[PDB]
A paper describes a structure:
Chalcone isomerase–like (CHIL) protein is a noncatalytic protein that enhances flavonoid content in green plants by serving as a metabolite binder and a rectifier of chalcone synthase (CHS). Rectification of CHS catalysis occurs through direct protein–protein interactions between CHIL and CHS, which alter CHS kinetics and product profiles, favoring naringenin chalcone (NC) production. The chalcone isomerase–like (CHIL) protein family is noncatalytic, yet it shares a “CHI fold” with CHI. The protein X-ray crystal structures of PpCHIL-A and VvCHIL reveal CHI-type α/β folds with high structural homology to each other.
Numbering used by the authors:
A (entry chain A), B (entry chain A): 41 to 247
The structure:
């Protein structure tokens, strides 16, 4: 089966964790400023096809109204089942620059919920340390696997030449805010990914 | 004599037009966002040493107070004498992306002064057309020469391989707003260049 080209970067149409997962959304992170676009990463979102059954309260809704519906994305983020994010570096950067973008996104959300406590701080520190020790060359790959059987996340960094590097995040709140960074509707870091997911899910939910 | 390294790009310490001109300020254009710096261009500002005599109303002022003094930079922009800007591309871009940044900076200033009239529009169109036909490879060089003897500007684009390409801007108002884009104090496109000029001129004005 053919790779899906996401802004000229190949993505598998299916990934298997504990279950077969389908590519149901993809997009990029970028900035458009001074009449210029600069692309940072490409993203693929992999979900169980059965997620359409968990999202039946939104059947008949269009992609445009699902794209602006933060309750919908809240349900998707918390739906039961396996989930997997695949991120491919476009602009080379220091690992610690992604670390701090992540840390700031997670800390901000924890603080807003008053959940920035000892365990969250310790878990987030371990994630920051993990990225601090990496260099994100172009086509490097970060993956976030969210298993259905625990409120944890396994983070893998892969780059040609080196062996895969891995950590497991054990704090549920930190794991939730990582999911929200990428998947929280109008607050997601990648509006293109949100629109693709929302359009793909609206179509599946109409059937 | 040694080249002056401006963020790893060489700049002559002196350029000769109608008169010998000294490098009195240099800096970069950049964006700092998402905990990351992206550098667009390096700038050198070349002025007659005699400009210190035209700026005597600001003698005894420090670099920090000259850096926040828009009357000072207004006097520098309009002072008599030869002036030369040298811009070296760091991030490769389309010519039309610099064209539109320029056009938007000039048009905005003309509009604020209600000077966006037929002649200005025609002159600015010719500048936009000039850049539209170029590709700004890294280390390409844009120079703006402002002669003391007319209210005009000669723009030169140079890149290795190709011959120099040149146009002459004949509209005084457009030429003034180009100078202000780069040199207008707290409104300049390059705060680093402003600070360097202001510190260099403060020191010379103290002698």
């Amino acid at each position: 089966t053919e790779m899906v080209m996401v802004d000229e970067i190949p993505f598998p149409p299916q990934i298997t964790t504990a279950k077969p997962l389908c590519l149901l959304g993809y997009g990029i992170t970028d900035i458009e400023i001074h009449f210029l676009q600069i692309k940072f990463t490409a993203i693929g979102v992999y979900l169980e096809p059965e997620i359409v059954g968990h999202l039946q309260p939104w059947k008949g809704k269009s992609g445009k109204e699902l794209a602006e519906n933060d309750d919908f994305f809240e349900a998707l983020i918390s739906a039961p089942g396996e989930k997997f994010l695949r991120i491919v570096v476009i602009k080379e950067i220091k690992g610690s620059q992604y670390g701090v973008q992540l840390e700031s996104a997670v800390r901000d959300r924890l603080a807003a919920d008053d959940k920035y406590e000892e365990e969250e701080e310790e878990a987030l520190e371990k994630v920051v340390e993990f990225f601090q020790s990496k260099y994100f060359k172009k086509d490097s790959i970060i993956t976030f696997h969210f298993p259905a059987t625990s409120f944890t996340a396994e983070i893998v960094f892969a780059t040609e030449g080196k062996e895969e590097s891995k950590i497991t995040v054990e704090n549920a709140n930190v794991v939730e805010m990582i999911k929200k960074w990428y998947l929280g509707g109008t607050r997601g870091v990648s509006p293109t990914t949100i629109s693709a997911l929302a359009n793909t899910l609206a179509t599946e939910l109409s059937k």
